[PDB]
């Protein structure tokens, strides 16, 4: 839906947060990574970046992305927005600060978008695992099998179940808007912000909308300008400085939230049952690590649970009261065995 996107336009902006290994070293990147949530079963993950996908500078236009290139929120077309864990993930959706993607297992998570001259990559160290459903350890959603109830990150654009906070951005330190006028520092307000400034001695700790040049400092290296703006808000991230805007616990819906769904689970090859009486031989020929769990239906359950990883033969003792065995995603099977004719009482 677009109304939620519009309500995300209300005060949310991209920000340049700190990112480790921006390709080859630490930096402050337009697209950071915070709180990557790989908890689903099939393999889907959600990454809360520091860039607004969808929203361009004017509207929504789903095929556009926006990010902070310095002092400007700049919008471009989403030409190549990729996510890698150990091989290129197939990103399923993007909205606000959040990407939703389908990654294979790996020890890293990295996002990156093309501006055309630049790649603006961000790589975080976060172990993400394949989490197969059921009782068989497959490593990719299979073509066929049985549907089981799983918990996956919904691909829906929006939902009001969960939220995240919005806070007034902290005063953004800067020095590029400090120059030398004749032989004296000069603060070039960007026409839209009230640049605070702090320099050699204590100065005016509120800033002024007009351009200023202070006489108590001569060189830029003892003077710095906190660029501020109270017209657009940012999500309170641990990697940004917290300002004095200690009000407005603003709210944003989290786009892709975990919900129940149906995941395919591998039906393992059926075993060879050899019901030689007084017992039960079971030849198992798995293709992935499968489970075999058995219990006796008498006063003594005597459970036996084991992970079969290769072709194997296991013998169980079926008494006259009953045995039950479950193998893989198959339903439990029951067998009652007695009355073998070995010997002759006469």
């Amino acid at each position: 839906d677009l109304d939620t996107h519009f309500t995300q336009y209300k005060l949310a902006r991209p920000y340049i947060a700190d990112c480790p290994n921006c390709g080859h070293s630490r930096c402050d990147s337009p697209i950071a990574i915070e709180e990557v949530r790989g908890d689903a079963h099939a393999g889907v993950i959600r990454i809360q970046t520091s860039a607004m996908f969808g929203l361009k500078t004017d509207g929504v236009d789903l095929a556009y992305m926006s990010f902070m290139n310095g002092k400007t929120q700049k919008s471009i077309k989403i030409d190549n927005l990729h996510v890698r864990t150990s091989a290129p993930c197939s990103l399923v959706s993007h909205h606000g600060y959040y990407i939703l993607a389908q990654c294979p297992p790996g020890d890293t998570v990295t996002v990156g978008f093309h501006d055309g001259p630049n790649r603006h990559t961000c790589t975080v160290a976060h172990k993400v695992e394949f989490r197969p459903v059921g009782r068989e350890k497959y490593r990719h959603p299979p073509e066929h099998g049985v549907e089981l109830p799983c918990n996956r990150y919904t691909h829906k654009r929006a939902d009001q179940g969960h939220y995240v906070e919005m806070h007034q951005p902290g005063l953004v330190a800067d020095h590029s808007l400090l120059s030398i006028h004749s032989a004296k520092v000069k603060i070039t307000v960007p026409s839209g912000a009230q640049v605070k400034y702090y320099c050699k001695c204590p100065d005016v700790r509120k800033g002024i909308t007009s351009s200023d040049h202070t006489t108590t400092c001569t060189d830029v290296k003892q003077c710095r300008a906190y660029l501020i703006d109270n017209k657009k808000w940012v999500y309170n991230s641990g990697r940004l400085p917290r300002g004095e805007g200690d009000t407005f616990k603003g709210k944003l819906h989290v786009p892709f939230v975990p919900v129940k769904a149906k995941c395919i689970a591998t039906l393992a090859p059926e075993p060879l049952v050899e019901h030689k009486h007084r017992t039960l031989i079971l030849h198992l020929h798995p293709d992935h690590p499968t489970l075999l769990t058995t219990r006796s239906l008498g006063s003594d359950a005597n459970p036996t649970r084991q992970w079969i990883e290769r072709p194997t033969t296991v013998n169980f003792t079926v008494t006259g009261e009953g045995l039950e065995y479950t193998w893989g995603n198959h339903p439990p099977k029951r067998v009652w065995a007695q009355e073998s004719g070995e010997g002759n009482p006469h």
Partner: protein, 49 residues
Amino acid sequence: ENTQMSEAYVERSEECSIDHAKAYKVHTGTVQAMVNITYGSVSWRSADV
């Protein structure tokens, strides 16, 4: 500077409303069944009891 404010606190996750383990206490409680009965010439008839 003599300053920095690392502020962390725990809370529930978004998956907590989807996958959680509930901790129940157990007492004896009750026991029931559902029987199916026939007698003489009346057909099968069943009921929770």
